[PDB]
Write a protein that binds this ligand. Structure first.
Ligand SMILES: Cc1cc(/C=C/C#N)cc(C)c1Nc1ccnc(Nc2ccc(C#N)cc2)n1
Ligand SMILES: CN1CCN(c2ccc(C(=O)O)cc2)CC1
Ligand SMILES: [Mg+2]
Lengths: 412, 556
């Protein structure tokens, strides 16, 4: 009810980010949503003396039919002061990723109950564009904590912890973690028990209040990892052995003691690629020794919260995608694979967008932040389409990979 | 007196840390001073400026300029320094409407709002920074000091604040009259509709009545401007649009500058004249920017210019947008990385046209370029019409399916259909997924000495076929490609090739059909001729037979 003073970081001005082009349906949706928000006092029209801008668009959350406004505050978020005054920061909870079930709630609507510092409001400016620029874009700024701004959960935190204490005190084994507009609630209860607890939780927010109804269910205890595995064959061709030596050479950068000497020796001469080569005892032993090495964890892997997380993704075909999350090369913190790309059988870009959201969710649950993606797509293709398939209320950072990696072969 | 509503003031600041301008007034002739005094006396009477006391420490220089072929002088208050110190504003006009997104109108009326402009007040707290001084006759009295009360011509904030002020006033009228459109440009309002003429006139009278609420009058004698309108390089008519005349000059010789202007005109023309090309003319501007330098046109550029003259020989117009109909975009390949397109709703009635050129880079293919063009047209269409057109593309559905399913990147093109208009985009080669039984296996390698640039490239095969060629002026990367080329040259229609070159794999896995490298182009030409090619990679220096033998032969 009293505002927290907020400032940008020293020697930085506000965001001045171009609004990207919007379809007619998204413009009409945003005009209707913002008319209501203005009436409720959440946003106000602004004049030309505010030169700032942040892009806005509209999405449909997963399994929903109502448009949701999504403001892309990535630039403002980078420019906004860090928040450690009251809390040093919320040590991320390591137990969340160990829960049998985690449900994600959209609690962003709670933030609109808290006013935003009057001197900071100008930096939240956004524009609803018109088709063909025929009419001046409709200009607004926020009067209340905005969804998607990193300052919102931070300022609202005292209110949330006070709203939640009785649920926590009554259920001490539930893990509850807030990230941006999301609330992550983990338990080891039978799902039925679990959903009732979730609905119990909704009621507290509802009671305090006077898209919240939705629930994204995850099961991180079943989440899958990808160790390095070598083929088991009875007949090896020259080509098979070449592929094996290739894969082992790559793996030797991750694992110290990998050897290819004896396997390489099998191919002495200049043989047809399809010729079958019997493994010698020396080669089988070396292979066996390599297999044993690959059953052990990679050495010297640790998470440093001061460093960015990086996520790489490979298209494997037939709807399959592999990914790795690391901070230092060859020191993977997590690897994985998807094939269950939903409602996207003839659309690569929709699949990739879904993969990016899934990986980001995993990252939030495990480390409490989003990774920087290296995306296997041309910039122009990604930027034209990703917004069509986006269902999350946060947005990670990304860069583009223009040269085909050879490593794709090694995660297949 | 009929009360009028004030126009709300926009609060204005200088940039952080900056004070206002303190710039010396130049001396002026006695004649200029008398003229400026008269001009300023009238502006003062009209309320535009006010005399100020000696306390204000700010100043901006003023000049007098003679209105050509006239005995009347005009003032120029030079606000360049104040402009540097004034905050940035939101600028609404950055993106201009494209004519092809406009809707047909029966009537468009122009209303003059030049007088309304001076009912927009300048923020009281900022006025002091606009101070200026008319020097006195013979410098024998204090110069006359004034400041502005209104948006000064030439000040940074005037266009934005005028426009934003008019928009705010007009908003309720537009909202409650959805059967008209209103557009402001400079000192004019344009008001369009499809109403019968009496009703349209009624709406105009109602607009005039609305504006009087703020004491804003428009001229009774209606504007002289009527369709067609010359605007932003276009001609707008009630039911069609075009570009203003495109006139390509005749020349015996061309400079860099002439050619930049020629390409600029062709670029502007390409938004409604189908098939305009600028590649060969643009190739002439490569690397050099001495505007006076004379560049001989190549035969190819002369052909391009001739083809464009023929395209431009007579007028072409676009139609406006009917939201009730689908948009269709059709694309053709023109050659040399050039693509052209038309966007229409009814057959043979284009809304607009355009072109796309290949991006600069080492290697490319037609499918990638077609994709790029689709993404450009899509983004353009979202801006202009708010929706994606249905595409008609010169690529078979089967070709596209093969491409996207096998390509290492994610890729997508929106709803489209094949149109069988040559030249069709096709895949020129496709590498095997598995080694070929019965095909000879070529182990290739190359190396070069980094100092002498001497090198070797070659192969050994499972049949005992071998070749090593000595090369000059080469590099490790070139020799690795040379070796693959030799293997392709010397093999039958099906071939397995084993390389350790990450560089060569990286190129071939990008699936180019054309390259800036003559060698890569030769390799592509060979690949096109094969029935089956399997390309296998192995790591260098690991004892892998075949590879190890050839590596030894090429390293010396
Ligand atoms: C952008 C624009 C420039 C001018 C004028 C600029 C100038 N000078 C005039 C108007 C009224 C507009 N606004 C819109 C908006 C939607 N459809 C149209 N259609 C439309 C406009 C003019 C003519 C004609 N003749 C026909 C159709 N105009
Ligand atoms: C009637 N007008 C509108 C704006 N124009 C101006 C605005 C300001 C000044 C001035 O500062 O004196 C002159 C013309 C040109 C034509
Ligand atoms: Mg070698």
């Amino acid at each position: 009810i009293e505002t927290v003073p907020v400032k940008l970081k020293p020697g930085m001005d506000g965001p001045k980010v171009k609004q990207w082009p919007l379809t007619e349906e998204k413009i009409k949706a945003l005009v209707e949503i913002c008319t209501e928000m203005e009436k409720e006092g959440k946003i106000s029209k602004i004049g030309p003396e505010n030169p700032y801008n942040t892009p806005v668009f509209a999405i449909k959350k997963k399994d929903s039919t109502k448009w949701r406004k999504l403001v892309d505050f990535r630039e403002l978020n980078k420019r906004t002061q860090d928040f450690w005054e009251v809390q040093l920061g919320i040590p991320h909870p390591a137990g969340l990723k160990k829960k049998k079930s985690v449900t994600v709630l959209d609690v962003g609507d709670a933030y609109f109950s808290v006013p935003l510092d009057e001197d900071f409001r100008k930096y939240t400016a956004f524009t609803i564009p018109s088709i063909n620029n025929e009419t001046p874009g409709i200009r607004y700024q926020y009067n209340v904590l905005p969804q998607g701004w990193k300052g919102s959960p931070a300022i609202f935190q005292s209110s949330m912890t006070k709203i939640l204490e009785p649920f926590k005190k009554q259920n001490p084994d539930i893990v509850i973690y807030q990230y941006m507009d999301d609330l992550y609630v983990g338990s080891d209860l039978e799902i039925g028990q679990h959903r009732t607890k979730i609905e119990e939780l909704r009621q507290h927010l509802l009671r305090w209040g006077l898209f919240l109804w939705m629930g994204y269910e995850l099961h991180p205890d079943k989440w899958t990892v990808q160790p390095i595995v070598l083929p088991e064959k009875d007949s090896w061709t020259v080509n098979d052995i070449q592929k094996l030596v290739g894969k082992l050479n790559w793996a030797s950068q991750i694992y110290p003691g990998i050897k290819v000497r004896q396997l390489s020796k099998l191919l002495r001469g200049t043989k047809a690629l399809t010729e079958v080569i019997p493994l010698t005892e020396e080669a089988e032993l070396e292979l066996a020794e390599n297999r044993e090495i690959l059953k052990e964890p990679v050495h010297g892997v640790y998470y440093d919260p001061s460093k960015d997380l990086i996520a790489e993704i490979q298209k494997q075909g037939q709807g399959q995608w592999t990914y790795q999350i690391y901070q230092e090369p060859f020191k993977n913190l997590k690897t994985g694979k998807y094939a269950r790309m939903r409602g996207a059988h003839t659309n690569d870009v929709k699949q990739l967008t879904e993969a990016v959201q899934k990986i980001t969710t995993e990252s939030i649950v495990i480390w409490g932040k989003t990774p920087k993606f290296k995306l296997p797509i041309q910039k122009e293709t990604w930027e034209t389409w990703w917004t069509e398939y986006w269902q999350a209320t946060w947005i990670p950072e990304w860069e583009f990979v223009n040269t085909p990696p050879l490593v794709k072969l090694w995660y297949q | 007196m009929v009360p009028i509503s004030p126009i709300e003031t926009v609060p204005v600041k200088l940039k952080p840390g900056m004070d206002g301008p303190k710039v010396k007034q130049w001396p002026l002739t006695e004649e200029k001073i008398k003229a400026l005094v008269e001009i300023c006396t009238e502006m003062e009477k009209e309320g535009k400026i006010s005399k100020i006391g000696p306390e204000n420490p700010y100043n901006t220089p003023v000049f007098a300029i003679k209105k050509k072929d006239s005995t009347k002088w005009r003032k120029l208050v030079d606000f360049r320094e104040l402009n540097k110190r004034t905050q940035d504003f939101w600028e609404v006009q950055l993106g201009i409407p494209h004519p092809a997104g406009l809707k047909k109108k029966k009537s468009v009326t122009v209303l003059d709002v030049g007088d309304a402009y001076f009912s927009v007040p300048l923020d009281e707290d900022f006025r002091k920074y606009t101070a200026f001084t008319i020097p006195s006759i013979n410098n024998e009295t204090p110069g006359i000091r004034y400041q502005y009360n209104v948006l000064p011509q030439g000040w940074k904030g005037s266009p934005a604040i005028f426009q934003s002020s008019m928009t705010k006033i007009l908003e309720p009228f537009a909202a409650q009259n959805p059967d008209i459109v209103i557009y402001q440009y400079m000192d004019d309002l344009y008001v369009g509709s499809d109403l019968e003429i009496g009703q349209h006139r009624t709406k105009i009278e109602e607009l005039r009545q609305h504006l009087l609420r703020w004491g804003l009058t428009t001229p009774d004698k209606k504007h002289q401007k009527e369709p067609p309108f010359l605007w932003m390089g276009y001609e707008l008519h009630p039911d069609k649009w075009t570009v203003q005349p495109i006139v390509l000059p005749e020349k015996d010789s061309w400079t860099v500058n002439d050619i930049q202007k020629l390409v600029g005109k062709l670029n502007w023309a390409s938004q409604i004249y189908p098939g305009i090309k600028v590649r060969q003319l643009s190739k002439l501007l490569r690397g050099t920017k001495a505007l006076t330098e004379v560049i001989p046109l190549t035969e190819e550029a002369e052909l391009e210019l001739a083809e464009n003259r023929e395209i431009l020989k007579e007028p072409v117009h676009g139609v406006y947008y009917d939201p009730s109909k689908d948009l269709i975009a059709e694309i053709q390949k023109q050659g040399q990385g050039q693509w052209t397109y038309q966007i229409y709703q009814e057959p043979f009635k284009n809304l607009k046209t355009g072109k796309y050129a290949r991006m600069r880079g080492a290697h490319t293919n037609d499918v990638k370029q077609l994709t790029e063009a689709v993404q450009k047209i899509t983004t353009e269409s979202i801006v202009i019409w708010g929706k994606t057109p249905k595409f008609k593309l010169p690529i078979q559905k089967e070709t596209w399916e093969t491409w996207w399913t096998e390509y290492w990147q994610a890729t997508w093109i929106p709803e489209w259909e094949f149109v069988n208009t040559p030249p069709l985009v096709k895949l020129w080669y496709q590498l095997e997924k598995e080694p070929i039984v019965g095909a000879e296996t070529f182990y290739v390698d190359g190396a070069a000495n980094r100092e002498t640039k001497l090198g070797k490239a070659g192969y050994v095969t499972n049949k005992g076929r071998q070749k090593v060629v000595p090369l000059t002026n080469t590099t490790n990367q070139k020799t690795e490609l040379q070796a693959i080329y030799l293997a392709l040259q010397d093999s039958g229609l099906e071939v397995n090739i084993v390389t350790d070159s990450q560089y060569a794999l990286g190129i071939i896995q990008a699936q180019p059909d054309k390259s800036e490298s003559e060698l890569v182009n030769q390799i592509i030409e060979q690949l096109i001729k094969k029935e089956k090619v399997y390309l296998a990679w192995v790591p260098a220096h690991k004892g892998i037979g075949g590879n190890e033998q050839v590596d030894k032969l090429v390293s010396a």
